[PDB]
Design a protein around this nucleic acid. Structure first.
Ligand SMILES: [Mg+2]
Ligand SMILES: [Mg+2]
Ligand SMILES: [Mg+2]
Ligand SMILES: [Mg+2]
Ligand SMILES: [Mg+2]
Ligand SMILES: [Mg+2]
Ligand SMILES: [Mg+2]
Ligand SMILES: [Mg+2]
Ligand SMILES: [Mg+2]
Ligand SMILES: [Mg+2]
Ligand SMILES: [Zn+2]
Ligand SMILES: [Zn+2]
Lengths: 77, 190, 49, 143, 169, 292, 55, 117
RNA sequence: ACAGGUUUGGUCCUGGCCUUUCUAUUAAUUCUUAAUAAAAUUACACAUGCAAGUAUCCGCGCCCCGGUGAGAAUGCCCUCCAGAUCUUAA
């Protein structure tokens, strides 16, 4: 690509982006599905964050980790 | 080759036993090279059209030797009876075009039980066989599945309200497109 | 309702532990509320508590 | 088809090192040692000659090393123990080839935890895979 | 090799066959032994043979020897918590010291097995990439899939030039 | 309480009936070779080496699990009408996880018609082979398992290799696995080649198939001709255990006959070539009594 | 990283102070920053053109 | 290398052969190249079907959900593949594309019916 | 290295060089098509085209990709991570 210190081209210096044609009956029914899908994926992301928290707590202060942490010191003594 | 149908007949014929005998076909063949060590790459192709490239290969010198996956006595001469490996081209003395075909014929014969090879003893894939898990068994269908409804109600095409249609058309003036209602259920063919 | 594959995964998870509960699992959307794009955002610096 | 044990002989100025080989490693030796073994009867052998390369000394040292061999039967007779061969392909099967004819000694041999063997760096390199020489893995003609 | 008294103890096999793996707490091993008397024969044989065996599999653990400082041979392990484990050896043989050390402070069979099983998980058979980390580079070589264009030529209907040419007309 | 192949009462008898033949168990294969090793051992050390070799050959003779035909997988998880013709081919999805067994992996398939179902066994095993290959498995079906190549491999008396290849290729609970196993079990007892499976790890499997097919005439006469009386009195006991309801099992109990007469009663009650079995038993008697 | 032969670059540190001072002293005021030409739809400060839907 | 920012993104690295695309599903940085340094490879995607007419797709769901809970973003083809698999709901882009395809088929049928008589 | 040639009236020993194998660039000679891989003199100076756009204004990215190896013996591997980015109440 270009750089921050490179000037733009002359063919696009005086160029503005143009939007395409918009179909309202399709755009609205697509935006509503967009929202219904984004809420679902947000809920799934929250579920995955909860699973990650559960696994991290099981790995930090788990009932399986404490047993080893105690039995190793016992055998050491 | 008069046979052209049974390559193994020549190996049992008399004109083979008096020429080669109990010795392999590459017994008296010696390949020339440049110094004390022959090259790691042998001749690519020894027969170009009708001309023979000087000293022919042990297989290519007598046209009655047909490379085929049926006559296993010929292919056995190129596989060590102890290690079961394939003899390489510098070891045999044949051209590469015939060595690749010999490797293919050996593999095809091993894939047909004609040529023996090592078969290791392999334990079963799974330690325990459990057909009760929900991976291979049937799962209780959803109430929306047994009813014939999509998994999500917003999967179907719903008609937006006329007020929302007008609100969109008021803001998207200039770029307005032809309207289109619900799409057909089944797509026809050509 | 959960997606089909994740629903099957959840139905197969607890089944191994001896849970015969055939109750339908649902995904909650309480914390899944999001603001539209027209909702203006804040411009101040966030406080790292 | 092979010799009994690995022979590392040192002639006047020719150092010969010959190792035992299975049925699949046929006469990968010097072009004169191969000529001698083809008339002797050895069909599988590996040999390396270092130092001098004189033909007469090479022949004399090869014959001396092949004559100073120790048969499994003679080893079993001198040790009063069974010479048990363990083929690597036959698994842990204790194959017996020579039996100690005579008085079978019931005294077990002293198991040395560290065998004081006289190894060679040329063999240590081959065991560790440090042989990066391009002339080592070259495909050559048959026997 | 050939030089030295025991050339066998300078081989990769000898250093790899020694199964002495300390725990994550041992940091320093100070071995103080003598050079006279029939008692320190075991300590001298241990220092001569088994020190490289332990040092090869414990590269992060310091191992320091001392000669003719105390009339009694001993070893001193300095743990991470500060506890000093003193092990006196006066008539112990070569293997007895190794077994005693493995019994007092070492990794169990299960401890080594779980670690060497967890290390196997990093190399996954399903991934793809170079031969250094993965078993397959390009999925073309799979027996069921489409072969590689450099090995098997693709038909004309699949070439991008034919699709770009049929769209021109 | 139906006796299964994994029951001890069947396994301990099958092991004794198979027997230990080290000269065939530890047989040099056709793989790479290396120079042998030599070491001096006493007689006690030789006996210890032989017993360790027996313990090792136990693992070689570990029996392969034989199961029944698994049920076909047919279950639809969802249906999407919008995907009626959006794709031409079907998408096969496989869950990769090293910490889970293969019997619990979700192998799903979205067909181009719009359905999302579970994959059949032939597709599940193929995908597991692709994403987790093991030595000895082919992704596609090998051509050697057809009738022509299989008949040729049987004529070349390679049934042990056929079994060791089929066990590695297919799952022991699939359909073609049982098909090929029964096909080779038909040929071995058609041609009288029971000796080829003497010391293999499939003798128990073929015996457990023969006791279910009630075809014991050929195996019994072949065991009698090899001077194997224990291997026949152990086979008749397996038959009696596997078929408790039967005249052969009831007459033996009501008579209290010994193991040597357990063969005669089985030859008289439910044997097809009973005259042949009786002639073979009499020929064994008139020879063994005179020679020993 | 951290070597014994590292040179104590001072110009790179002085340029930071120079540009920090020039950011605050020559800070463009919001008036001319948000000034707008209603004919060309071009910002005279930055040089960006406004979108077509906002015309 | 050192970046000024960026976010973890589970994308498809197109590493393959000419006229034979091959996408490796991988979680990597967002400012790194396509086939550059990555964090963890999860699955693979084969666009061209094999002899059985099947397009093989691989997903390591256990690590996928872990990374998504850790805060990794997804791309359009990754979301499309997840919707086709059933781990995520079907994408509205896929839905509207199916609707557009149905409308194109309907227009094709109408044109074929009007050009026949 | 399985090695071979080369000193001397001649032998042995010591000994250097070369040949034998494999890869890459240029030059000569010759030359028919496809596919795949790769296009490698220049940190010497550049004519010309394009490579950073998006958006109801705000803002966001603008050596990120891509390019090269002049300097640095620079470095490989290992602890700690300020700070920056994504989602959260953390
Ligand atoms: Mg520039
Ligand atoms: Mg010389
Ligand atoms: Mg490419
Ligand atoms: Mg001189
Ligand atoms: Mg050129
Ligand atoms: Mg030129
Ligand atoms: Mg902008
Ligand atoms: Mg670069
Ligand atoms: Mg310098
Ligand atoms: Mg940090
Ligand atoms: Zn040829
Ligand atoms: Zn490829």
């Amino acid at each position: 690509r270009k750089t921050r210190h490179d000037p733009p081209a002359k063919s696009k210096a005086g160029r503005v982006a143009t939007p395409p044609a918009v179909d309202p009956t399709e755009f609205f029914v697509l935006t509503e599905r967009y929202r219904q899908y984004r809420q679902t994926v947000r809920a799934l992301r929250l579920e995955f964050m909860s699973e990650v928290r559960k696994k991290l707590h099981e790995a930090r202060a788990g009932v399986q980790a404490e047993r080893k942490a105690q039995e190793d010191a016992a055998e050491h003594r | 080759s008069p046979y052209k149908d049974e390559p193994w007949k020549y190996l049992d014929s008399e004109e083979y036993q008096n020429r080669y005998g109990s010795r392999p076909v590459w017994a008296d063949y010696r390949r020339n090279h440049k110094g004390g060590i022959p090259p790691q790459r042998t001749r690519k192709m020894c027969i170009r059209g009708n001309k023979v490239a000087g000293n022919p290969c042990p297989i290519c010198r007598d046209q009655k030797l047909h490379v085929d996956f049926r006559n296993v006595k010929l292919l056995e001469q190129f596989v060590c009876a102890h290690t079961g490996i394939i003899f390489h081209a510098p070891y045999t003395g044949v051209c590469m075009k015939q060595h690749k075909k010999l490797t293919q014929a050996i593999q095809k014969a091993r894939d047909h039980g004609l040529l023996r090879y090592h078969i290791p003893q392999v334990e079963p894939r799974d330690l325990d066989f459990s057909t009760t898990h929900g991976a291979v068994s049937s799962t209780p269908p959803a109430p929306t599945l047994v009813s014939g409804d999509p998994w999500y109600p917003w999967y179907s095409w719903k008609q937006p309200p006329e007020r929302e249609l007008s609100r969109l058309r008021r803001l998207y003036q200039g770029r307005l497109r032809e309207e289109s209602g619900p799409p057909p259920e089944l797509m026809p063919e050509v | 309702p959960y997606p089909p594959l994740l629903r099957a995964m959840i139905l197969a998870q607890r089944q191994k532990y001896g849970d015969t509960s055939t109750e339908e699992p649902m995904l909650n959307l309480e914390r899944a509320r999001i603001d539209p794009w027209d909702y203006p955002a804040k411009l101040e610096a966030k406080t790292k508590t | 088809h092979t010799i009994y044990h690995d022979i590392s002989l040192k002639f006047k100025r020719t150092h010969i090192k010959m190792k035992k080989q299975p049925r699949g490693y046929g006469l990968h030796c010097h072009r004169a040692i191969m000529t001698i073994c083809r008339l002797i009867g050895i069909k599988d052998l590996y040999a390396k000659v270092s130092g001098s390369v004189n033909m007469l000394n090479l022949t004399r040292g090869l014959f001396l090393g092949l004559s100073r061999q120790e048969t499994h039967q003679q080893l079993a007779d001198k040790k009063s123990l069974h010479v048990v061969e363990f083929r690597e392909e036959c698994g842990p099967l204790p194959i017996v080839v020579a039996s100690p004819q005579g008085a079978l000694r019931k005294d077990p041999e002293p198991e040395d935890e560290v065998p004081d063997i006289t190894l060679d760096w040329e063999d240590v390199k081959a065991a560790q895979g440090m042989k990066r020489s391009v002339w080592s893995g070259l495909k050559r003609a048959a026997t | 090799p050939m030089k030295g008294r025991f050339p066998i103890r300078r081989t990769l096999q000898y250093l790899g066959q020694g199964d002495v793996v300390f725990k994550d707490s041992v940091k320093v091993m100070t071995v103080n032994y003598n050079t006279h008397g029939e008692l320190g024969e075991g300590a001298r044989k241990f220092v001569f043979f088994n020190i490289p065996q332990i040092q090869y599999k414990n590269p992060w653990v310091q191992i320091t020897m001392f000669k003719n400082m105390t009339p009694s041979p001993f070893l001193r392990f300095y743990l991470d918590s500060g506890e000093q484990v003193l092990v006196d050896v006066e008539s112990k043989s070569n293997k007895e010291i190794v077994e005693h050390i493995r019994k007092i402070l070492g990794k169990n069979e299960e401890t080594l097995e779980k670690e060497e099983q967890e290390k196997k998980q990093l190399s996954h058979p399903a991934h793809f990439g170079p031969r250094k980390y993965c078993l397959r580079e390009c999925m073309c070589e799979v027996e069921g899939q489409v072969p590689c264009p450099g090995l098997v030529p693709l038909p004309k209907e699949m070439t991008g030039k034919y699709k770009a040419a049929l769209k021109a007309t | 309480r139906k006796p299964t192949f994994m029951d001890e009462e069947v396994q301990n008898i099958l092991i004794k009936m198979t027997g230990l033949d080290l000269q065939k168990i530890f047989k040099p294969a056709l793989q790479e070779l290396k120079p042998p090793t030599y070491k001096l051992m006493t007689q006690a050390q030789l006996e210890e080496a032989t017993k360790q070799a027996v313990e090792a050959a136990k693992v070689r003779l570990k029996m392969p699990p034989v199961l029944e035909e698994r049920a076909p997988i047919n279950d639809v998880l969802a249906e999407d009408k919008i995907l009626e013709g959006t794709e031409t081919a079907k998408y096969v999805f496989t869950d990769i996880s090293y910490s889970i067994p293969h019997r619990e992996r979700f192998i799903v398939v979205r067909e181009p018609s719009g359905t999302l179902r579970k994959a059949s066994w032939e597709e599940r095993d193929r995908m597991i082979q692709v994403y987790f290959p093991r030595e000895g498995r082919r992704i596609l079906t090998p051509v050697i398992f057809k009738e022509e190549n299989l008949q040729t491999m049987y004529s070349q008396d390679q049934h042990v290799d056929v079994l060791n290849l089929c066990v590695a290729q297919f799952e022991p609970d699939s359909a073609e696995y049982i098909k090929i196993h029964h096909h080779t079990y038909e040929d071995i007892d058609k041609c009288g080649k029971y000796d080829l499976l003497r010391s293999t790890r499939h003798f128990g499997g073929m015996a457990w198939y023969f006791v279910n097919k009630k075809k014991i005439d050929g195996l019994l006469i072949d065991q009698i001709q090899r001077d194997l009386v224990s291997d026949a009195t152990s086979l008749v006991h397996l038959y009696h255990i596997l078929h408790p309801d039967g005249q052969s099992a009831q007459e033996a109990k009501k008579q209290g006959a010994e193991g040597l007469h357990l063969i005669k009663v089985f030859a008289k009650t439910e044997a097809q070539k009973g005259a042949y079995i009786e002639l073979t038993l009499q020929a064994y008697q008139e020879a063994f009594i005179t020679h020993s | 990283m951290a070597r014994k032969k590292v040179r104590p670059r001072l110009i790179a540190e002085l340029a930071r102070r120079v540009r920090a001072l020039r950011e605050q002293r020559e800070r463009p005021r919001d008036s001319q920053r948000y000034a707008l030409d209603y004919e060309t739809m071009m910002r005279p400060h930055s040089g960006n053109r406004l979108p077509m839907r906002a015309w | 290398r050192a970046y000024r920012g960026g976010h973890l993104t589970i994308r498809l690295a197109l590493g393959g052969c000419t006229n034979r695309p091959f996408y490796r599903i991988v979680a990597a940085h967002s400012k790194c190249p396509r086939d550059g340094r990555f964090v963890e490879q999860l699955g693979s995607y084969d666009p061209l079907p094999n002899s059985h007419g099947e397009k093989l797709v691989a997903l390591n769901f256990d690590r996928i959900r872990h990374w998504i809970g850790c805060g990794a973003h997804l791309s359009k083809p990754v979301e499309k593949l997840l919707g086709l698999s059933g781990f995520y709901p079907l994408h509205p882009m896929m839905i509207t594309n199916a609707e557009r395809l149905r409308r194109k088929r309907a227009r094709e049928v109408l044109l074929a019916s009007q050009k026949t008589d």
